[PDB]
Amino acid sequence: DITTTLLHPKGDHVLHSHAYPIFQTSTFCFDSTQQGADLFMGKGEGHIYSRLGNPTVEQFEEMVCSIEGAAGSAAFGSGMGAISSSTLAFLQKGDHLIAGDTLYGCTVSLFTHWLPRFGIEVDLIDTSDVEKVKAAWKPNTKMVYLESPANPTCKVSDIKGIAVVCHERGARLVVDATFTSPCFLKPLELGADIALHSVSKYINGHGDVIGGVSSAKTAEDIATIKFYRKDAGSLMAPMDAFLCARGMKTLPIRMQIHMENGLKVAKFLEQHEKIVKVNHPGLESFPGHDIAKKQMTGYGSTFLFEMKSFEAAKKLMEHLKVCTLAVSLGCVDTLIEHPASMTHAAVPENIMRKQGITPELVRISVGIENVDDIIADLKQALEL
Amino acid sequence: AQDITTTLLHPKGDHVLHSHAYPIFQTSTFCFDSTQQGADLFMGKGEGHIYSRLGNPTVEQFEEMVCSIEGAAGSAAFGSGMGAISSSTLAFLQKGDHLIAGDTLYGCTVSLFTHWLPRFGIEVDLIDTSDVEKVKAAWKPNTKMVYLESPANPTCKVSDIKGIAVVCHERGARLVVDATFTSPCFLKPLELGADIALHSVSKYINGHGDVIGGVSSAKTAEDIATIKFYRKDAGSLMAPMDAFLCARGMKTLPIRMQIHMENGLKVAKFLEQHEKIVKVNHPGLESFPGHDIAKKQMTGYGSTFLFEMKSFEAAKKLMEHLKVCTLAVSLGCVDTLIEHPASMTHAAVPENIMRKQGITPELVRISVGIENVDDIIADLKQALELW
Amino acid sequence: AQDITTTLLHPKGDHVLHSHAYPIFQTSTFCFDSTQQGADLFMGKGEGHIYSRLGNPTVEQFEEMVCSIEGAAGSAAFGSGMGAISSSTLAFLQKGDHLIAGDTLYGCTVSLFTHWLPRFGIEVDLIDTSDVEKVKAAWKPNTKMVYLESPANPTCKVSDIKGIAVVCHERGARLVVDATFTSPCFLKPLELGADIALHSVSKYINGHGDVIGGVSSAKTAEDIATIKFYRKDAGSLMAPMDAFLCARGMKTLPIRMQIHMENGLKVAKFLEQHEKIVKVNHPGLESFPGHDIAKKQMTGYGSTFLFEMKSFEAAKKLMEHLKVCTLAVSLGCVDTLIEHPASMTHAAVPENIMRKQGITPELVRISVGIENVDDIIADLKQALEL
Amino acid sequence: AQDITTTLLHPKGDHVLHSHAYPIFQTSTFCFDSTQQGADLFMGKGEGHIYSRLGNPTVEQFEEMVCSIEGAAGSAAFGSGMGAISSSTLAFLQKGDHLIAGDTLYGCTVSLFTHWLPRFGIEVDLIDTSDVEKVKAAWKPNTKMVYLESPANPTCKVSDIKGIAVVCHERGARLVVDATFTSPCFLKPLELGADIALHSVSKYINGHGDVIGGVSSAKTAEDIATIKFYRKDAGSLMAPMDAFLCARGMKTLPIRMQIHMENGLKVAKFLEQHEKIVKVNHPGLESFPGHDIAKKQMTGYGSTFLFEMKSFEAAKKLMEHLKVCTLAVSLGCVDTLIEHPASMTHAAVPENIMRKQGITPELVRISVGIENVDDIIADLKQALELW
Ligand SMILES: CSC/C=C(/NCc1c(COP(=O)(O)O)cnc(C)c1O)C(=O)O
Ligand SMILES: CSC/C=C(/NCc1c(COP(=O)(O)O)cnc(C)c1O)C(=O)O
Ligand SMILES: CSC/C=C(/NCc1c(COP(=O)(O)O)cnc(C)c1O)C(=O)O
Ligand SMILES: CSC/C=C(/NCc1c(COP(=O)(O)O)cnc(C)c1O)C(=O)O
């Protein structure tokens, strides 16, 4: 499985060290003027300066590249860095971008405030309906950007169907697969051109690092992305790369538990009288379950449910003993959040409506704690 | 008036669990007491933390240190100098705006302004900013920003920061200054009229050659908020461990700069009088054009500068036979570094910009560290005197 | 009751500035509010910190996690397993005391007990602790301690911890158990009657091969205070960064141990039926001597064990033609390690005491990781055909 | 001869993958090429690594830096000063041996020597080592070691290291010196005849208040090997991250020490002439007994020293009303620290030893940092002149 691959990354040992060393350095020495000059022209093997390339970071990049099935991967200081670099490395004044209508808050901010200032046209549309994508299409359409399942509502898009449109019509497909991890969703295997993650979430999974990663189908696209990163400057620190690579060693095993724990918690919620509705892609009752079972080999453990009022969401969120009230997701312990007033508080009213985000919704990110302990925590909070 | 050495060693803030050194907050998220307290923090109400991309205690401590020396309204830390530069320009410039920038700049700044900005509909002109009249002649109705690096990397070309600020202030343009080469001990652009002062922290501020990072400081609370708003979406963050290391390096910044300044002037004078050396571009030498501007507008000099050999082969022979100096890119480290701009830091600069910058194969750039200055001069002398 | 997985993920204690992950207190010293407040802390009242050698918040968080799983009065972290062992024995033993220790121990423990303790006037007997009557027969009027490893490094020899604890309780001696090889998920010596339980945290507890450290946990508040008092003067400290890494590694200990156990078991059964293998020393095999004791005293098994090849040449051929397993010392890492005890971990052990622990040039020690077992079996299988 | 500043910035050793900063080997174990190569390293021949308890590259780099300044045959790093002290004594002393140690020592060293060593059959006398005749009078046929701290913590009592060395050399005893208070910039006990020189690295060497560590250096390959043999079984290891930080702190050791030495002397003179101050114990003052010995045997002074107020109440009022100085134990940090030995560092010292040390409630110990010395003096002055 994917576990052996992750624990046995390709490459040589450094001074026979079993654990890969942390290259906490800015610069590298040259043997001669020519050797230094050659590296600047991309000939020969070696390093120049950590913003161009750091061995500890490259090891992390290789690990993600191996499970994505990519030509190459680039690490960043945050998911937002991956997202900016995977879009603005390509899009320019006069170009048009189609993006999902329901996206992580700060992605809405990027697509909605910054891109138009740089002369990029952006439409947000319901990407669960492939014909809706075809109708928004323009002659200057250069990219489609998807998040599936979406944050926070878990709305599922047909990545593979959109990928066909993109191939035929000459556009890049970018997919944020943060919510599912590369164990369960491999967008490049579905026709996508770029797959990206907030490493801050599942990939690292220990709640102690912010980082991003972007993987490209072609060698030319990852070189462009890295060229942008050189100038935009969102870098993963060597220490964070050591921590991310370390976290990734247990990724396959953690995902297995996240997925099963998640399925079980959602079912407890779906059949509980105080719960109106549960948005989890693995449920038969959820719209897009068929597409998601087809296009993914498993599910993340972050999902959303509806209470009967705002008072009751507040009641539940503030009387839990095990779950922690905090933003973020995909950590080893359980997190709980209120999107309307937190993660998606800054999202414009009209995008708020079309997304379906209301004060009645509560988002949970189920950890790898014993499931029954998680359920008993939710139980006492709901029933008391 | 308390000395800068004392200020850096005693930054404002409450201790955390009485810890003498400020802890490393290696965390992504923060817990809320209640939905309301968390809701409130999201709308800027109250004091506290949400998520490290928005604000991390260890990073904020480093920001406060830099803010206190720049004399700013606030500072923002980044994953690299280039993150600070992108976020200090593109947070304000939009399609249809015009930027005037110096014609001699760090190579990747040239890349950013010359490849990326035009793609975003931003008009850019690279101008000799050592002549205020050339800046005025380049001005247009839509000019919104002037960006300077002075002394410039790598030729040390000096721009009249005060003189250019007057023009920005009269015409509604922001003045942004990259002061990396001098450090905030010696060059404080906010006191000269700049709106934004920024640094690659990777050089002098950290000083120890073991971190890549950036910082930008704004005169106005609104401009720093805009910068951090851009940083939130562009995602160039300083990691907590890197902030801890940068704050630690900065504790010795004033005494390191004092030694760098003195060492670099002595090495530049030795080189200036050596038979093998054609000329020396250090802004503290009386022979240097713009020495008079540099001495009025700065309070000292960094120790990174450039000199001319008689040939490319003489430069290669020198660079490769040093035992104290290290052949490598970067600068501002405690130990002495040396490099060849034409084929290294500036090799990717388009040909017309590189000849406008005056960069040729005979030039060598040296970044003098805090080693004993006589050991540095002896290392250079032996190499210059080779069979 | 709350499951161990949940307990490790939700340790007791206040958050620091609302930080979700516990901060790394990379500091030597702490500030006082007042002379009295500083003087009061030095007298042990009430709450706070002075200096990291005395107590560091990051390190104490890790200590609390181990203490919670051991069921102890308290825990102390060290710079290495050898620091935990040294501090758990010499904190109590003095000139004229006598120590009974298992005859099969980690090589450096042998070095401690055999070279250093006798120089400090402490008498030491290495005896076969798998037979409780031999423990009784070695007993002396000055016996103050029994030290056990079970299963032993590297042969996996099992001792009757429960039976020996009764004798220790009867005769007024402390029982100290190194449970490194099994982890506190599966072996809990303090439940068995031991007074002190210790681990090289370098192995499973951290489990990522990137930290050296030790921990010792005591039944009584007085004993853990004595251990810490010794640590204050001896100076084997866990660094704040290493404590951050050990706490973090420990968050997945329960699920890692589960895979290590199942993985190890299957590899061991593969080897036991392979015609190039004379015997497998895995305590979870029905064949192995003292399996009966190990099944009763432990709730699982570690993934490190030993097995015999036909010759030294064959052992050499195995270890040098593997593609997935790594030739290296240590154990309990996420990936598979392989080692040759006679010329490595136990090379320094005196021939005399080496003879009677039954370690020969034909023995090979394997530490099974959390890789897919099928891949580990294939690696072994391919190499057993050259 | 190359300056110590240059030596510390250019340590011998190969670069690792051309990295300018030495990497952090956050690893427990190392891979072997073959059964033979692994077996050989345990023997041990020739070059390479096994397991970080036996040797770690990052830690070994820090060890070489110390070894080069001490002029030793080798150095060993530890998890704490106490770790270095335990391993520099108990690696050699066994049951039946006799140790002579100073009567004024760091409190936890008194604890080690008076509680733990006797439990191991080692005979210990604490002696006034400021008088070589008292040392000779305490000598017995089984004396194997003399252990000194000079200037002593906290009273700065000076011992004649050179005089005592002559006696150790003639009689077959090892001389062990704890030079923490002075740093290896100013005191090199191996040049004065000591067999072992050690430090709490937690103080000046690291200098930044953010690590606990120890180091010990021996004049002979055999002695450093025995120390490392002891270390491997006692298990007091320096962590890879802590070694990276100590090596980084030590890059500025010579310049920090120069500023500490001058600041401390100026603060001691200010205090000495102040009406509130009864006495000042700084070995650089001509009024101090043993000033003549310190001057001859050291090439400078650390900046930690003690002074006498008129009362406990006056000491407390001083300590609690400082804005620059920080109230906390420890010393040798870049910022100034202040402490009350009687109730803090030396509170657990048996009262027997407390009075031969001369430690009273009127004494305050100050560790003067590298802040501007006028800011430090103004902070003391304002607190001394309080209503
Ligand atoms: C301030 S709110 C906490 C952050 C949350 N998510 C982030 C996120 C990013 C961006 O990733 P960073 O830049 O690493 O945070 C990208 N893509 C997706 C699907 C995401 O969910 C959150 O709690 O929903
Ligand atoms: C590959 S070459 C090494 C880098 C060099 N300089 C960097 C630099 C930056 C950018 O700062 P980071 O992003 O922190 O590197 C910004 N501003 C200025 C005046 C700079 O000199 C160099 O060796 O000249
Ligand atoms: C160079 S040999 C590698 C080390 C091995 N183990 C060590 C060990 C320790 C000591 O713990 P540290 O001090 O953390 O190593 C204590 N107790 C037990 C049961 C052990 O196995 C080894 O591979 O057998
Ligand atoms: C709990 S009190 C704070 C510690 C202080 N000093 C320490 C010290 C050590 C021991 O070094 P570590 O083990 O690194 O602390 C050794 N040798 C000497 C001359 C020392 O001064 C103190 O504030 O006086």
Q: Which ranges in C251-298 belong to alpha helices (H)? A: 253-272, 291-297
Strands B337-339, B326-327: pairing kind: parallel
- Written as six digits, the tokens of A245 are 């690579």
Give dist(CA A345, CA A85) in Å, integer: 24
Task: Give start and end residues of each alpha helix (H) in chain A.
Answer: 2-7, 33-40, 55-68, 79-87, 105-109, 115-117, 130-136, 159-169, 219-232, 238-248, 251-270, 289-295, 310-318, 349-355, 371-383
From D106, D111, D236, D330, the mutation candidate for ligand 4 (largest count of ligand atoms within 8 A of CB) is D106
Phi then psi for residue B7, to 5 deg, are -55, -45
C75 phi/psi in degrees, rounded to 5: -130, 150
Length, in residues, of chain A? 384
Give the count of alpha carbons within 13 A of D300, CB side only: 20
Determine if ligand 2 sits within 6 Å of the CB of residue B215. Answer: no
- Domain B254-387, CATH class in plain words: alpha beta
Q: How far is the CA of A210 from the centre of ligand 1 (A)?
A: 9
| Smallest Cα distance from D278 to chain B, Å | 28
DSSP D114: I
Take residue D204 and report the two structure tokens written for it.
Answer: 């000046």
Pairing of strands C277-281, C214-218: unpaired
Ligand 2 in reach of B88 Cβ (< 6 A): no
Residue C328 · residue C357 · CB < 8 Å: no
User: Residue D58 belongs to what H/E stretch?
Assistant: helix D57-70
B178 labelled catalytic: yes
Q: Which CATH number fits domain C2-253: 4.10.320.10, 3.40.640.10, 3.30.1490.20, 1.10.1670.10?
A: 3.40.640.10
Cα D291 to middle of ligand 1, angstroms = 64
Q: Give how far C212 is from chain D: nearest CA, Å.
A: 6
Question: Residues near B174 by Cβ (< 8 Å), separated by ≥ 6?
Answer: B92, B144, B145, B146, B168, B195, B196, B223
Residue B41, number of CB atoms within 10 A of its CB = 22
Q: Would strands B196-200 and C277-281 be described as parallel, antiparallel, or unpaired?
A: unpaired
Q: Are B27 and C20 in contact (CB under 8 A)?
A: yes
Q: Centre a 10 Å sphere on the Cβ of residue C373 and count the other Cβ atoms it contains.
A: 19
Give the C-alpha separation, C361 to C122, whole Å.
32
Cα separation, B241 vs B24, in Å, equals 6
Structure tokens at A378: 């939710």
In the structure encoding, which two tokens stand for residue B98, read together?
Answer: 């015009």
Question: Relative to the CA of D54, which ligand 3 atom is closest?
Answer: 1
Measured in angstroms, the resolution is 2.2
Contact (CB<8Å) B256/D255? yes
Nearest to A87 by CA among A173, A162, A161, A155: A173
User: How far is C-alpha C353 from the geometric centre of its chain's CA atoms?
Assistant: 21
B331 lines ligand 2 (CB under 6 A): yes
**Max alpha carbon distance in chain A (Å)?**
74
D178 is known as an active-site residue: yes
| List A51, A138, A230, A379, catalytic entry | A51
CA distance B185 to chain C (A): 27
Contacts of A325 in chain B (CB under 8 A): 31-32, 34-35, 38
User: How many whole angstroms separate alpha carbon D309 and alpha carbon D277?
Assistant: 5
| C-alpha dist (Å) from residue A266 to A124, A188, A263, A290, A303 | 29, 29, 5, 17, 8
CA of A6 to the centre of ligand 1 (A): 24
Q: Do B26 and C27 touch (CB under 8 A)?
A: no
For chain C, how many helices (H) and strands (E)? Answer: 16, 12
- What's the first-to-final CA gap in chain C, in angstroms? 52
How many B/D residue pairs have CB atoms within 8 Å?
87
Sheet holding C74-78, edge to edge: C74-78, C214-218, C196-200, C174-178, C143-149, C98-102, C123-127
Is C178 marked active-site? yes
Written as one letter, the residue type at D18 is H
Chain-chain contact of A19 with C210 (C-beta, under 8 angstroms): yes
Residue spans of beta strands (DSSP E) within chain D: 74-78, 98-102, 123-127, 143-149, 174-178, 196-200, 214-218, 279-281, 304-308, 326-327, 337-339, 363-367
Ramachandran assignment for A94, one of left (phi > 0), alpha (psi -120 to 50 degrees), beta (any other): left
Q: Most distant CA pair in chain C: distance in Å? A: 74
Structure tokens, A134: 């075809």
DSSP A260-321: HHHHHHHHHHHT-TT--EEE-TTSTTSTTHHHHHHH-SS--SEEEEE-SSHHHHHHHHHS-S
Parallel, antiparallel or unpaired: strands D304-308 and D279-281: antiparallel
If phi over 0 gives left and psi between -120 and 50 gives alpha, with beta otherwise, what is residue B17? left
Return the residue matching tokens 């009127």. D362
- Between CA A372 and CA A377 the distance in angstroms is 8
D342: DSSP letter: G
Task: Return the residues preceding each gap in chain D, C–N over 2.5 A, or none.
Answer: none
Task: Spell out a b/e string for C69-85, using b for 16 or more CB atoms within 10 Å of the CB, else e.
Answer: bbebbbbbbbbbbbbbb
Where does chain B have alpha helices with state H? 4-9, 35-42, 57-70, 81-89, 107-111, 117-119, 132-137, 161-171, 221-234, 240-250, 253-273, 291-297, 312-319, 351-356, 373-384
Domain boundaries, chain C: 2-253, 254-386
- The SS3 of residue B310 is coil
Q: How far apart are CA A144 and CA A164, in angstroms?
A: 12
CATH class belonging to A1-251: alpha beta
First to last CA, chain A: 44
The CA distance from C229 to B25, in Å, is 30
Q: Which residues of B touch D376 (CB under 8 A)?
A: 6
d(CA B253, CA B182) in angstroms, rounded, equals: 12
d(CA D367, CA D333): 8
What gap in Å lies between CA C21 and CA B241, rounded to an integer?
A: 14
Distance A163 CA to ligand 1 centre (A): 24
Comparing CA positions, the residue from C309, C310, C265, C311 lying closest to residue C288 is: C265
Whether residue A217 contacts residue A188, with contact meaning beta carbons closer than 8 Å, is answered with yes
CA D241 → CA B335, C212, C245, distances in Å? 21, 12, 11
- How far, in Å, is the centroid of ligand 4 from the Cα of C289? 51
Q: Return the H-helix or E-strand segment holding A174.
A: strand A172-176
Spatial distance between the Cα atoms of D31 and D211, rounded to a whole number of angstroms = 29
8 A C-beta contact, residue C100 and residue C127:
yes
CB B355 within 8 A of CB A56: no
Nearest to D234 among C26, C234, C327 (CB): C234
- Those residues of chain A whose CB sits closer than 8 Å to some CB in chain D are 13-19, 21-31, 46-47, 55, 242
Ligand index nearest the alpha carbon of residue D339:
4
Ligand 4 pocket: which residues have CB below 6 Å?
C 50-51, 53-54, 235; D 80-82, 106, 149, 153, 178, 180-181, 200, 202, 212, 214, 329-331, 345
D342 in Cβ contact with D360 (< 8 Å): yes
User: Residue D327 and residue C34: Cβ atoms within 8 Å?
Assistant: yes
b/e per residue, A158-195, with b = 16+ CB within 10 A? bbbbbbebbeeeebbbbbbbbbbbbbbbbbbebbbbbb
Measuring CA to CA, which residue among C102, C92, C86, C84 is closest to residue C212?
C84
In whole angstroms, how far apart are CA B237 and each of A81, B22, B215? 9, 19, 10
Kindly give, in sequence order, each residue whose CB lies less than 8 Å from that of residue D14, ignoring residues fewer than 6 positions away.
Answer: none
User: Nearest CA to CA, how far is D155 from chain C (Å)?
Assistant: 19
- Give me the residue label for tokens 């802890």: B23
SS3 at position D51: strand
Per the CB < 8 Å rule, is A233 touching B39?
no
- Closest atom of ligand 3 relative to the C337 alpha carbon: 23
**How many cross-chain Cβ pairs, B to C, lie less than 8 Å apart?**
71
b/e map D32-60, b = 16+ CB within 10 Å: beebeebbbbbeeeeebbbbbbbbbbbbb
If one counts every other C-beta atom within 10 angstroms of the C-beta of residue D105, the result is: 28
Nearest to C19 by CA among A332, B25, B18, B59: B25
Q: Would you call A51 a catalytic residue per the annotation?
A: yes
What is the spatial distance between Cα A307 and Cα A275, in angstroms, rounded to a whole number?
Answer: 5
Q: Which ligand is nearest to the CA of D177?
A: 4
Residues of chain B with C-beta less than 8 angstroms from the C-beta of A117: 94-95, 120
Give the pairing of strands C214-218 and C196-200: antiparallel
Q: After which residues is chain C broken (C to N over 2.5 A)?
A: none
Contact criterion met (CB < 8 Å) for D28 and A14? no
Give yes or no for a contact between B90 and B82, defined as CB atoms under 8 angstroms apart. Answer: no
DSSP secondary structure code for residue D151 in this structure: S
D17: which 2 tokens?
Answer: 């993958």
DSSP H or E run through D165: helix D161-171
How much helix, strand and coil, in percent to the nearest 5, is found in chain D?
A: 40, 15, 45
Residues 6+ apart with CB under 8 A from A160: A190, A191, A294, A295
- The residue among D227, D198, D229, D243 whose CA lies nearest residue D79 is D243
Nearest atom (ligand 1) to Cα of A343: 2
N- to C-terminal Cα separation, chain D:
55
Query: What are the residues of chain C with a beta carbon less than 8 Å away from any beta carbon of chain B?
Result: 15-21, 23-33, 48-49, 57, 244
Q: Which fold has domain C254-386?
A: Aspartate Aminotransferase, domain 1 (3.90.1150)
- Atom 3, ligand 2: residue with shortest CA distance: B330
**Rounded Cα–Cα distance for residues B326 and D57 (Å):** 21
Q: B357 alpha carbon to ligand 2 midpoint, in Å?
A: 16
Provide the sign of the torsion angle of the four alpha carbons C269, C270, C275, C281, taken in this order.
negative
Give the DSSP H or E segment for D352.
helix D351-356
Interface test with C, best of D52, D212, D339 (most C CBs within 10 A): D212
| Binary contact (B26, C30; C-beta < 8 A) | no
Q: Which fold has domain A252-384?
A: Aspartate Aminotransferase, domain 1 (3.90.1150)
**To probe the interface with A, which of C3, C10, C250, C256 has the most A CB atoms within 10 Å?**
C10
Pocket of ligand 1 (CB under 6 A): A 78-80, 104, 106, 147, 151, 176, 178-179, 198, 200, 210, 212, 327-329, 343; B 51, 53-54, 235
**Residues C324, C376: contact at Cβ < 8 Å?**
yes
* C242 CB within 6 A, ligand 3: no
For residue A328, the chain C residues in CB contact (below 8 A) are: 20
Question: DSSP state, B197?
Answer: E
Ligand 2: nearest atom to the Cα of A233: 13
CA distance from start to end of chain B: 55
* Phi/psi at A174 (5° precision): -110, 130
Q: How many angstroms is it from B207 CA to the middle of ligand 2? A: 13
How was this entry determined?
A: X-ray
**Rounded CA gap, C217 and C76, in Å?**
6
How many Å lie between the centroid of ligand 4 and the Cα of residue C235? 11
Cβ neighbour number for residue B229 with a 10 Å cutoff:
16
Contact yes or no for B28 and C20 at CB 8 A: yes
- D103–chain A nearest CA distance, Å: 44
Report the distance separating Cα D199 and Cα D346, nearest Å: 19
